[PDB]
RNA sequence: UCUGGUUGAUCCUGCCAGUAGUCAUAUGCUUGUCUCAAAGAUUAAGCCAUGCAUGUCUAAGUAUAAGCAAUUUAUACAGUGAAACUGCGAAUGGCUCAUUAAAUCAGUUAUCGUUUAUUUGAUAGUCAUGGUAUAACUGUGGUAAUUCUAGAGCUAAUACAUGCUAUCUCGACCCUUUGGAAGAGAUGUAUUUAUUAGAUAAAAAAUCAAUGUCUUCGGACUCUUUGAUGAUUCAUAAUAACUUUUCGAAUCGCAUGGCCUUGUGCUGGCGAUGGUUCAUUCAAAUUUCUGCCCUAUCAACUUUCGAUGGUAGGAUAGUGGCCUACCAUGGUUUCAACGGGUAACGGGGAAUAAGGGUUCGAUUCCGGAGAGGGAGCCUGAGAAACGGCUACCACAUCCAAGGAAGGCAGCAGGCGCGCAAAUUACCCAAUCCUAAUUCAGGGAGGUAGUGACAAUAAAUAACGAUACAGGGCCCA
RNA sequence: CGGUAAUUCCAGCUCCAAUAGCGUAUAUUGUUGUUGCAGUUAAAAAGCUCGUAGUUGAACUUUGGGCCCGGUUGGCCGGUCGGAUUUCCAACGGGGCCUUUCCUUCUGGCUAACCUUGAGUCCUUGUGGCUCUUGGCGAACCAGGACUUUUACUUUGAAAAAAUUAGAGUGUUCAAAGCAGGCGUAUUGCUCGAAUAUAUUAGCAUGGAAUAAUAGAAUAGGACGU
């Protein structure tokens, strides 16, 4: 439960910046809304077609 | 914690105390003092749970306030006084001494002694040094603290102190065929003369004990205790004489 | 405030340490005394169980010891003239521990005129010194090691520069002028 | 915070809930020696579940070892001191022999029942109620006492039962009061 | 882990039926007794009205309450004692496991790398007694308001700040004992720095420099102390200085003796506090070995910005990249590094089987963590405290609009749905704990209350007699 | 069908289960296989050949014999007013010598022990029995130095808080429980307890020497040595 979704986020606000360095800071060496993304790719789908 | 407690819980208790379970949540934490945590008793406890003779923190209380008992001459008004093995207990209005000493049980055990022999007292000697304007001085089991000893004593070296000046009545050295206590381990109690020590350079040095009915068996160093010679006790012993049978 | 603590570094794997518990008492930091030349400013601090401790803020003079004469002088400081770790320091004047400084030369010259019945510059199997030693008499100021912590003491006590760590350290000027 | 005061539940339910084997042997003893039930059946056979099982966990340890002999001695002699095991069958093999009707004949009701202290053992759990038998000096309304030797030699009415002791109850006194006051009417 | 079913019957492969539990979670009905015992969970570590949970005094710290008691010895005082100053505590207890996957925890170390208020035991020859105050209190005030205060006038300390008050050694002589004697030398600590000592393996000579007992003036060097650790620059001793220079009692209570130059001169008991150093005790802080759940459709990883090692400093209570400089390029990993998941607080323990095992363990003890969360700090031996303080954010409160206050994962008690589960009880009488100290106080704790947590024992009837008929019962 | 103060009418039907507890609902029964699965066909073996790690890997090195000693059992045994321990052989491990058999060296100590010897001997004809000591037992481990294969394995010990588990004893009236209690001259006091076990990985000490390695003296740069 490294990353969790709390019940009071803007009680653990400021924990969540450290966990944001936390994240950022493990996975730099990784580095170095589904209805409008749905709704994004049909539209480029149909961009498309009409380019087409 | 953010420091020190000053909260003794019923089980946190050591076990050879022998105190129950349901008379408390609680057991007395012991005040600082010679002896460490876990190898002392309480003399509330010493008096209630063994003597019997009280039975409240109240009547203690007012026992250690009519100043009656002196440990090793000195009374204490502290009930919680950490007392340890080998202890000198002096009862005036019962006219009564008693060492505290282990049990064969592994627990301690009171003994009924007379003036001449709370008089004095024993001390295993665990430190000797030299001190400031290099004065030599030692630091006993029971912490002792006395300047100025005979030089032929060494560290870990029992030692017969008359209480009554707090002097250095006599010393008894560290030889093979001495007569040993052990004070802890699973084998305190048993009175037993030493055969050998096995020694390590900085390791825990394992000592080897026989026993009256030629048994024997290993515990280290701290345990060891020297009484006397063979046969030849300083003290009087209790029933049993530190035996283990079955 | 300042701390110590070694969970907040990499791992001996390389790893990122998360955070254990909040940082405790027992385990800060405390500011360095950048103790410098001018007048007496000490501080004193009560640390753990209550114990004092001095630091120097401005300091004018110290205390130096001759150690093949085994005597001490309290001399004044001229200013820092190298040290092992930083000529930043060195610039700034900065009093700490193992600084090579010049100071006066006037007390332990009376001191070796009254002790010998003969001068410095311009009995006598021991009081043949050392050449570069008559030579800072001469001029005045002496070469010292200030071995002391100003800082944590609030002391300033240190030695005169003898003949090798002399030889090596004025190797060391002479490369760094 | 305190210490757990220890306890148990002091039975165990059977494997197969319903057999007929079973449940006549329950019928038989349980109207045998006036029970009430089958939790009391569990309690009983529990306990020599548990015995019989020690038992044969010394049978599987080796002769002579201290740790056999002085277990088989304390359970042998806690038999035979509430007076289960007799003293020929001071064995190890009679001990797997024990049986739960022995238990229930040394179970007290059954006892008094033998003494002929009451017509059925009904009646005698009847009277264990009421509370009129004292064991030894002791006055026990549980049927279920498991006595020993000295203590079923020691059987007897109580002192204050109206039987074997005080004044009657108070339905003979309330009878005599009504008769009296009728025959001074 | 089994039982039943196909065929005239039999055996395996088969399919189907049946089968089991699980302080697992709800739910329903019922409920007298006795004893005992519990009383968490929205992945809400979400949010709170109230009220309560920390102060303590003995002969003995500071008393003119214009406090009381009078009164009987007290014209400084004496009893009690508000308040107030001073002391100590308030760094435990209780609640929770958010977080945290070699981290803790556990075992096993070790600190010759740290400090310790307190206990305890030792431990110091190196003025018939200064001053400053201020509370409490008196008196004038502010405001909407708070455990807000301002001005002024007093008075004290165990406050504050000051502060002074012979002993050995050698020993010529003399005389012999019970010796006493001219003369020579020396005389605290604390801190810091530099130096010296702090030994030991078995013979004897030469040399120089220095010159010590006796000089039998030639020289012999005739006795020559040193502890410990496995080990040490250790214990300890000496030198030379150093310090915004520490200590070496300007304290107190009970009583009052012995003297005697009759001074109101000299000595004298009990105990109470404080005090340097060391040791103890209680500690804490570091530190070793060994051990973690899953994850390769996670294989390379860390090093600007310390990652690896070195030298110097700082900081610390100390070791240490802990940090800073200047240096070298390291380090780990397929024996799985790394990073990710973990409704993951660790363990003792709990359940289960015959074992091997499996699965839990917030939950009576221990360890560590936290007290809406970020950041930081004072005091104190002990706090990064939260029934302390500073700022942020989040809410959120009072009002006269101005300012003011805030932290129940303590004890009851409450919201978070519209559906709902312990008592805003009593007591510190026990066990303990805290203090000036027996006496104060303690939602710690106990008492009892409260839904069939869980558990123990067991009642709802015994017994007889009488009448009524031949019928009653078993299996197939 | 009539009736609701109207009816006494499976009186108010029978049987099974548990019981002061009981029902229900949801989820989990050699089918993971070190013990202890499978791979012809209902599911599952490399197109061929090599090949890093890892795993796993022929045999051999002091054996054998003899002596002496004594335990620990089985019986013939029984001495005794329920067991003491003597003779005997069967075995069962054990210890010390010798059989070519490091068994660290010396420093001095402590000598451990008769290769020692100076006398006598209690008692069944006596290698069936022992008091003190004149050249002596180097290993008896002391303390001093200086080196010697390391394991794995396994035996023993100390450890691993308590509680909990097992378990001793104890008429809480039984019992769960709990660790109390019991016994005088109740007129003024005597005693027992509050056992025991377990607890596995690492660590320490310890015996063992099979197993499995390890290393040695070949450019001898080798060993002992006056």
Known sequence: ?52 | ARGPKKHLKRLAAPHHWLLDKLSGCYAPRPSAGPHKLRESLPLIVFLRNRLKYALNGREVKAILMQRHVKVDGKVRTDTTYPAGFMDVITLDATNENFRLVYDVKGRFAVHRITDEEASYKLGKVKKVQLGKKGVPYVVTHDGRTIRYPDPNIKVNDTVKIDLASGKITDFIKFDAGKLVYVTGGRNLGRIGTIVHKERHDGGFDLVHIKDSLDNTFVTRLNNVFVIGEQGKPYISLPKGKGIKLS | ?177 | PRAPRTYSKTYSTPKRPYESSRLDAELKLAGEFGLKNKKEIYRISFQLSKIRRAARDLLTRDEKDPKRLFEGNALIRRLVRVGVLSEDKKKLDYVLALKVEDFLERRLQTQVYKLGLAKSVHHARVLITQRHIAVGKQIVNIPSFMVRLDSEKHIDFAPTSPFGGARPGRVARRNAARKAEASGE
């Not at chain 3, 001095?54 to 001490?72: C, H, K, M, P, V």
């Open chain 1, 1 to 52: 439960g490294t990353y969790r979704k709390r019940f009071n986020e803007k009680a653990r606000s400021g924990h969540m910046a450290k966990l944001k360095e936390l994240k950022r800071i493990r996975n730099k060496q990784f580095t170095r809304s589904k209805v409008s993304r749905l709704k994004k790719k049909r539209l480029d789908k149909f961009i498309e077609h009409q380019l087409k």
């Open chain 3, 1 to 177: 405030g300042i701390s110590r603590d070694s969970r907040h570094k990499r791992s001996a794997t390389g790893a990122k340490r998360a955070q254990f518990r909040k940082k405790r008492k027992f385990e800060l930091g405390r500011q360095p005394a950048n103790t410098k030349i001018g007048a007496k400013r000490i501080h004193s601090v009560r640390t753990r169980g209550g114990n004092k401790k001095y630091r120097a803020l401005r300091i004018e003079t110290g205390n130096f010891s001759w150690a093949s004469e085994g005597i001490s002088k309290k001399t004044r400081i001229a200013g820092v003239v190298y040290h092992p770790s930083n000529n930043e320091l060195v610039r700034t004047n900065t009093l700490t521990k193992a600084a090579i400084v010049q100071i006066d030369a006037t007390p332990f010259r009376q001191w070796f005129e009254a002790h010998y019945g003969q001068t410095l510059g311009k009995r006598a199997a021991s009081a043949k010194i050392e050449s570069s030693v008559e030579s800072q008499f001469s001029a005045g100021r002496l070469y010292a090691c200030i071995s002391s912590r100003p800082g944590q003491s609030g002391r300033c006590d240190g030695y005169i520069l003898e003949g090798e760590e002399l030889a090596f350290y004025l190797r060391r000027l002479t490369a760094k002028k």
